[PDB]
């Protein structure tokens, strides 16, 4: 993992020299005197009437003895490591390194600190070290490829970073180019770029010279072409990403339809004791269209939770919080043409819930009598075929027994 | 600054012609630009419809169970961590698969390509010409397995045509299609190994469990906090694997140069706890399991040993050795005919010398149901067998079922202890299966199933020592075993004493084998499995009672065997040598011995190693242990 | 006029504490509002799944020829 250490160190170097560029500009006062190093430093003033612009303030920035050397050292190490990586990895191509836009910013912001060693009165020369922050962002993108420290989190964090470089370049560019005219401070120029890139445009601080006006124009154009790309990456990440209280009960079905759901909701919530309860539906099938409309009703939006999963995956039983459920209703599917198959699934579902949550009362609906002794451990079992045919036969003995039983097992107040 | 809506106001139109011009220019901009934007939107909508050392994974449909079995096994090795994985699957990515690939651990490692191995463009996108390996895996969920085998033969040929120097790892379903991908570096036939393991379980109990644990990469850390002694020992010994090392380079076996194989095997176990199971000479390619006492060791041989850790990765115990710093094994050493079954059912069927009937049995005499000219018997009751029956409940009789009978009829199996084999087939066997099995003594078939109790009682389930259930029957994946699980559970309640062996598609379903709901112990095993699944153990199903007893196994084990062969090229060969699937002259066979009260004076397993290696030169792999667990 | 990005500039912060507060308020607004917007985007997405004398036409499947 030494390769990541090298890039991590280089990323630290790039942000260090940007901060050193900041430190220079808080300690560089132009009114004291601006010139090329030593002799003939000249005091200057800005004339709004005369259209000509003196370039000596922009060309020359007073640099301390310590500051120039330490930034020369930092630039050399960063240059050494970047060319170390370039010479380390060719990967079958010697050309095309400079056309990819990171070498141009690297050399133009670094080798001036190398040439300044030869000619001493060139030590106080302006070099755009603030654009080096862009390379630091690139050095952070490649670090994301290897170690996390959350998939789209990195893309958002990269978006915030390019926001910073956009603002950071604006403040340093505006402050420096305005050092010839109106002598903007860093704090004032920082406020200027925030209200510019937010399109507020107060106008209390505005570029008064054509170099500064042109910088704002190109910065606006750069902002409007580099930010939409970052937005589109987030859009693609967002698109591919798209594909409570105590005392709940879990409802495990194979396919939930609007008739089965309302029969439960009408019966379950007919009791005042069960009103603080919410209901988890664990169904492998995608939610029905008719079911979605009812769950959108504000009455059932907070009460009914639909989970797409299996009782046979302990992860889906974990998302359903079956270890904390008050009860589990495993209900067979009667629409399925193979009822032995449907009974096998509910036996498996009953066993899966019993394996996961032994202290969870099971309520099983079994279709066929032959499969009823496989879920006998369950607290409550209803065999559909036994009761259907016993009610049908009793209707032949005692008329309307099925009606009598039906009314009794429905919670009603006798107000019909 | 106007069209960007910044509007500083330092420069503003001072006359009404200019003020009106900027008004109409703003309105023109706001009506001409959105038309361009919607054109871009329409173009964007219709447009929407790495490093070195990768491996390609070619499947027909990738599901979450197959993917994690690969990812767990592939990335269990530190050598394979800089590898990324390309999945070339024609099918659109599964919803369950997408969530796992969204996990940051697997986002950078696993690439999913929708394409075919049969399009050189899709093999180009997969960088197959640069892949370290290609795993072509058959689809078992497909109802037509001949069709699935045809596709993987075509996929193997397509990859071999495109990338001749790309090691192929093929998973073949049916034995008859296995000689079409023989060129591949590593091939695993599911039906051979399934039925050889199922048959060996009838001879040596829980062989499928023993093989399953060995072909899984584990550190032996499972159940180490368990209060139960058997669970701490069981999970510790599961960390054993098969490794190979050159004898001269081996700190385990170098001191035994010029000594017999059995001498080294005993003493290397007595000293370090490694089990020398086989070796490969430098002259030959053949790996021999237990060459025996006549074999003399040499520095050029490759030694195959079972140990918790590799010798190189056990560099701690050797330093831990420096932290400390029965007769003896010798340094120097109707009656059936014995022959080869005449009609080999398929090409590549290794010829095993078997117990053979002196005369071919007529097809009528192979039917347990109908009486014939030679016999009027209509069920296993009228036959009056001397030994207990093995009842195989299979759907169709094919070449896999052939591979179930050969291990049980082999010549080294004792002739008195022969178990009659009754095949409980759903469909009537073809005459090609009958000609392959007509020479085998006491092999019968009958129509029926495991859900039909009438057929099962007719088969002779009353006196069957084993009932092997291979019966094959969903959108929700784990529900594929539901019918087999419940049908087998029905016999577990009707015949509590019967030994039922099953194969399940999903190892998650192994908990439902012999399900006692009103049982705190089996319910407590659920918590242990969740803790092991919490610690990232790939052997979490291990502590379920049916699996540990050899009652269940899954074919997904065979997938891990094929993935392991990327790192252990000897692994497939070792397994088939143990299963008897490949028969090399001079190679031993997996056997079992019972430790009775007459052998208890041999107190320990090391002394049993000494006694066996001093008399019969057999190398004990391990112990099948039974304890009293009143339910 | 700030949070609507109009920025007339007739009234502007004239001291650095006020200028900084506007900057942090703009940044806070641009990071707290999109979260609310995407929450509305989530709710809108899942929510997507006359006169007198009419007649009703009840069919099981309506095709262009029958219509
Ligand atoms: K009532
Ligand atoms: K303004
Ligand atoms: K193992
Ligand atoms: K191991
Ligand atoms: K017969
Ligand atoms: K059968
Ligand atoms: K504005
Ligand atoms: K404005
Ligand atoms: Zn006959």
Swiss-Prot record, chain A:
Q: Which cysteines are joined by disulfide bonds?
A: none
- Chain positions carrying an annotated carbohydrate: 43, 47
Q: Where in the cell is it found?
A: Cell membrane
Q: What is the effect of changing residue 219 to L?
A: Reduced the potency of the agonist C23 by 7-8 fold
- Membrane-inserted regions that do not cross the membrane: 186-206
Enumerate the residues binding K(+) 1: 200-201
The residues that the entry says bind Na(+) 1 are 407, 410
Transmembrane annotation, as ranges: 4-36, 64-88, 103-118, 126-143, 151-178, 209-242
What post-translational modification does the entry describe? Phosphorylated by protein kinase C. Phosphorylation of the C-terminal domain increases channel activity.
Q: Where is the RCK N-terminal domain?
A: 246-382
Q: Which domain of life is it from?
A: Eukaryota
State the tissue distribution. Answer: Highest expression in liver, brain and spinal cord. Lowest expression in skeletal muscle.
Extracellular membrane side: 37-63, 119-125, 179-185, 207-208
What's the family? Answer: Belongs to the potassium channel family. Calcium-activated (TC 1.A.1.3) subfamily. KCa4.1/KCNT1 sub-subfamily.
Its job: Sodium-activated K(+) channel. Acts as an important mediator of neuronal membrane excitability. Contributes to the delayed outward currents. Regulates neuronal bursting in sensory neurons. Contributes to synaptic development and plasticity.
Q: Which disease is it linked to?
A: Developmental and epileptic encephalopathy 14: A rare epileptic encephalopathy of infancy that combines pharmacoresistant seizures with developmental delay. This severe neurologic disorder is characterized by onset in the first 6 months of life of refractory focal seizures and arrest of psychomotor development. Ictal EEG shows discharges that arise randomly from various areas of both hemispheres and migrate from one brain region to another.
How does the annotation summarize its subunit structure? Homotetramer; which constitutes the Na(+)-activated K(+) channel. Interacts with KCNT2; these heterodimer channels differ from the homomers in their unitary conductance, kinetic behavior, subcellular localization, and response to activation of protein kinase C. Interacts (via C-terminus) with FMR1; this interaction alters gating properties of KCNT1. Interacts with CRBN via its cytoplasmic C-terminus.
Q: What is this protein called?
A: Potassium channel subfamily T member 1
Q: Which organism is it from?
A: Homo sapiens
Its lineage reads: Eukaryota, Metazoa, Chordata, Craniata, Vertebrata
Residues included from the entire protein = 91 to 522 of 1230
UniProtKB/Swiss-Prot annotation, chain B:
Q: What is this protein called?
A: Potassium channel subfamily T member 1
Superkingdom assignment: Eukaryota
Q: What does the entry's PTM section describe?
A: Phosphorylated by protein kinase C. Phosphorylation of the C-terminal domain increases channel activity.
Similarity comment: family membership: Belongs to the potassium channel family. Calcium-activated (TC 1.A.1.3) subfamily. KCa4.1/KCNT1 sub-subfamily.
Main location (coarse class): membrane
Q: Where are the transmembrane segments?
A: 15-48
How this chain assembles, per its entry, is:
Homotetramer; which constitutes the Na(+)-activated K(+) channel. Interacts with KCNT2; these heterodimer channels differ from the homomers in their unitary conductance, kinetic behavior, subcellular localization, and response to activation of protein kinase C. Interacts (via C-terminus) with FMR1; this interaction alters gating properties of KCNT1. Interacts with CRBN via its cytoplasmic C-terminus.
Briefly state the protein's biological role. Answer: Sodium-activated K(+) channel. Acts as an important mediator of neuronal membrane excitability. Contributes to the delayed outward currents. Regulates neuronal bursting in sensory neurons. Contributes to synaptic development and plasticity.
Please tell me the disease that this Swiss-Prot or TrEMBL record associates with the protein. Answer: Developmental and epileptic encephalopathy 14: A rare epileptic encephalopathy of infancy that combines pharmacoresistant seizures with developmental delay. This severe neurologic disorder is characterized by onset in the first 6 months of life of refractory focal seizures and arrest of psychomotor development. Ictal EEG shows discharges that arise randomly from various areas of both hemispheres and migrate from one brain region to another. Epilepsy, nocturnal frontal lobe, 5: An autosomal dominant focal epilepsy syndrome characterized by childhood onset of clusters of motor seizures during sleep. Some patients may develop behavioral or psychiatric manifestations and/or intellectual disability. The phenotype is more severe than observed in other genetic forms of nocturnal frontal lobe epilepsy.
Residues bound to K(+) 3 are 367, 370, 375, 377, 383
Source organism of this protein record: Homo sapiens (Human)
- Which residues participate in Na(+) 1 binding? 213, 216, 238, 240
The RCK N-terminal domain extends over 52-188, 387-523
Where K(+) 1 binds, per the record, is at: 6-7
